[PDB]
Structure 1
């Protein structure tokens, strides 16, 4: 039925393209790839899967395949090429509401396109990812975090409603008011319960510009205290975005230059500072203020901080240019063949009470004396802005840190071993971290990830919405 319409492809080129991801570490060939022209095609697949005894195929939903460890694969199954839903010129897959208070976006749509459509109506989503070439459905199946999340929550806290087709092949509209169980399950739900075909995203009046600062520290305690100050509830302070980065001594000049923020003269000044202080690690807060009034507002906030005097660095850019900053980084790295490489990324949420310990063991310990390529990102988040009824798992403390160690790769085995060593350190130290963007490979690890109560809920939702255990098998939770 679908295959004859050219939609279900089994040819080598189709299966090969759906067999690798951004991680570039694991691969798994699907039996077939669906190229749906409409949500009707997805209903048809899931309905067939639901109603057919001896249905052979697991089903994954490939967004843009930005997964690190095969989460978007369907080994010997069917991968849905979600992008196909956006092929047709009409009808539009992104609709800003009549009053401009939300934007409807297809699950397959990339956030960069949501941005552009929103800005055309003078509005924009409030909560982002660092990198915009990711799908709406993909980030919402994880959490979606960036420097705005401290004050607006992750992207999953900025969804009004969704259309989801479940593993039963039923199209369901869900929200806090209707089918809330599915709504909560799908958000951070790792593609386990159904496919998001549309999500209603909160927007705000679009700021025109961002004053964009980097502040330099040699002292982790000062660096982290200041991040916590900037992101503390008052309602929040003036900063629109707060992240941070870590720079190890061995690759200091190189890693500073690789931010794309510091000029060569800037780098030289920071290298000189680290030298005089014999610092093994340098830290930088990255913050923005969306908008002479800016000058005074910025001066007032900076006055509350304790970065090294002389080491505030400023840029002033269009809001959209700030948001899409990493696109330029990809273009540059790709030209040098340094983008499409293995990415043994380590991402976790570390409770505030143990972040100094993590710094001691990892940044001042394990990572020392290595050539680091890729950003090491660290910044606090506020639990209050997360909904613990949703599937996403976070640490128990009111404040926890996003720690994203974005290693680019004989190097791969070394980096993989290093990541195991970091996790070993955390476990031995009794740090109650949660992984993010990682898949686990046995039951006990997944149960630990969610905790007993949330796991049991996760299973209840799985039985309700995907009883055959077909969906997103690359997460290795039920497969």
Structure 2
């Protein structure tokens, strides 16, 4: 027997089973794994979400797991619902009204539907002279999707990840109950969902903190051949003083074998800059080159430009990058934030976007980053042609709420390490997948206590180690409270 509200979804054509629908919801950005769902739900309102979830909760024996597809940027099927129901979240935003993104009247925050993509949140915020303070490097991800992970970029060191910049949320638990939560109301759900990997319920609305939107960003890259100086400077730039003037701090690693190509692919360096850096590398006989990428946000004020030069000159004076290897660009704030979009378009038309992405994303404690550099950047990755950026930058644990579901290393400072390998060559995927296992194995043997990010584990012991025994028990307690039937986001392979 089908509940009335559930059948209604079928009648209205919102609950589809056609091969076209199931196929679209069976693959993701990873392009590595696939799983066809039994049906796809195209909700037009959050009421449709309650119907499905309420049905599953009241219907004994309900065999359909449910996933919430944001934009499917998951790497290993975390958004799939094998033989179940995949909710096409984007459908919640088809209606030209009511709006799915509303900047508060006081301009202190912006309400965004969970299905909304950050690029749109940005545009709707800029319209009101404000903007979220913590981003992701790529803006075509959903609010609910990044919040179910953490949401990190070069601003997280001072504003924390996106999950640390949410005032409250509307969540529909695995029981089918609509619940508004925050640090004051239903905090137990609020904390569980943030970094919760879609295990406790679906986020239909997230209240995102905003700050006055800067007009431009002074964009700089500093080059190093010495990892010690590179990491020391990234830490100096992101160390609590209150923080330094930098609005964003990230870093890149360039292996010597493909130095010129990767430097050119940054879209930042000119061929003249590339030549200088390649020469520098040879002079120092470096097998790896490092680049700090940082920005200084600022407004159109008449003195802004001059003030920026002085602030930047001052900050750079505290650093140790190779003399004369500071490279500057100055762009509109939005242009910087959406800087990766241009890369996607190019790669896609070139047929290099819709390919396997055996990406390795992890958090490495500061005390072992130098060891990671030696074993990975100067070790495992040496002797290979790298297509895709190798991103490395420090984060401050103080800006992360351990009470939430997201797991992080125990040290005060840890690095986000993102090796965005693209299986561009024919069937080069197997090598890359093996390489990532080798990197993780290297870390396990060196005793490096890392945390993976946006990655799913297929073994319970791994998820327990990921969260930590105590934090795991907490995760289970919340799972038993918000999704006892273990139906939500089975693709994470935590309870499925």
Task: Please confirm whether the aligned pair reaches a TM-score higher than 0.5, indicating the same fold.
Answer: yes
Counterpart Cα distance in 2 of 1:438 and 1:12:
28
Judge which range, 258-267 or 392-401, deviates more: 258-267
Q: Deviations over 1:135-185 (max 9, x none)?
A: 000000000000000000000000000000000000000000000000000
2:396 counterpart residue number = 382
Q: Does 1:60 align with 2:70?
A: no
Cα offset, 1:334, TM superposition: 1.1
Return the offset for 1:317. 0.3
Query: Corresponding residue for 2:109?
Result: 102
Q: Distance in 2 between matches of 1:293 and 1:385?
A: 28
Whether 2:481 is the aligned partner of 1:471: answer no
Superposed CA deviations along residues 211-257 of structure 1, whole A, max 9, x for unmatched, are: 00000000000000000000000000000000000000111011111
Shift of 1:332: 1.2
How far apart are 1:335 and its partner, in Å? 1.8
Secondary structure of the residue aligned to 2:56 is helix
1:168-217 per-position Cα deviation (integer Å, ceiling 9, x unaligned): 00000000000000000000000000000000000000000000000000
- Secondary structure of the residue aligned to 1:325 is coil
Summarize deviations over 1:81-140 as a string: whole Å, max 9, x none. Answer: 000000000100000001111000000000000000000110000000000000000000
Any residues of structure 2 matched to 1:383-462 within 5 Å, and which?
Answer: 383-409=397-423, 410-462=427-479
Normalising by structure 2, report the TM-score.
Answer: 0.96
Q: Deviations over 1:243-278 (max 9, x none)?
A: 000000111011111111011111111001101111
Give the CA deviation at 1:293: 1.0
2:195 is paired with a residue whose SS is coil
Other structure's SS at 2:340 match: helix
**Is 1:351 matched up with 2:365?**
yes
| Superposed displacement of residue 363, structure 1 | 0.3
The correspondence for 1:123, drawn from 125, 130, 151, is: 130
How far apart are residue 442 of structure 1 and its match?
1.1
> Shift in Å at residue 424 of structure 1?
0.6
Measured after TM superposition, the shift of residue 394 of structure 1 is 0.2
TM-score, length-scaled by structure 1: 1.00
Task: Quote how far apart the aligned CAs of 1:378 are.
Answer: 0.1
Displacement of 1:333 in angstroms is 1.0
Per-residue CA deviations over 1:29-85 (Å, capped at 9, x if unaligned) read 000000000000000000000000111200000000000000000000000000000
Q: Distance in 2 between matches of 1:85 and 1:105?
A: 11
SS in 2 for 1:185: helix
The offset of 1:307, in angstroms, is 0.2
Runs of 4+ aligned residues of structure 1 deviating over 3 Å after TM superposition are none
Q: Distance in 1 between matches of 2:61 and 2:397?
A: 43
Q: Displacement, 1:380?
A: 0.1
Larger CA deviation: 264-273 vs 218-227: 264-273
Give distance in 2, aligned partners of 1:57 and 1:353. Answer: 45
Could you say what the CA RMSD is over the residues aligned between the two structures, in angstroms? 0.4
SS at match of 2:285: coil
Query: How much has 1:381 moved relative to structure 2?
Result: 0.1
Secondary structure, aligned partner of 1:2:
helix
Q: Which of 28, 33, 37 matches 1:26?
A: 33
How far did 1:323 drift?
0.3
Instruction: In structure 1, list runs of 5 or more residues that go unmatched.
Output: none
Give the superposition deviation at 1:398.
0.2
CA–CA distance in structure 2, aligned partners of residues 29 and 221 of structure 1: 47
Structure 1: distance between partners of 2:16 and 2:272: 54
**Number of matched residues?**
479
Q: Match of 1:3, SS? A: helix
- CA–CA separation in structure 1 for the residues paired with 2:94 and 2:391: 35
How far apart are the structure 2 equivalents of 1:285 and 1:126? 20
Distance between the aligned counterparts of 1:266 and 1:331, measured in 2? 24
Counterpart position of 1:147: 154
Distance 1:106 1:134 in 2: 12
Q: Deviations over 1:263-314 (max 9, x none)?
A: 1111111001101111100000000000011111100000000000111000
Distance in structure 1 (CA, Å) of the matches to 2:61 and 2:449:
41
In structure 2, how many angstroms separate the alpha carbons of the residues matched to 1:264 and 1:329? Answer: 18
- Taking the aligned partners of 1:388 and 1:354, their CA distance within structure 2 comes to 21
Cα distance in 2, alignment partners of residues 437 and 102 from structure 1: 26
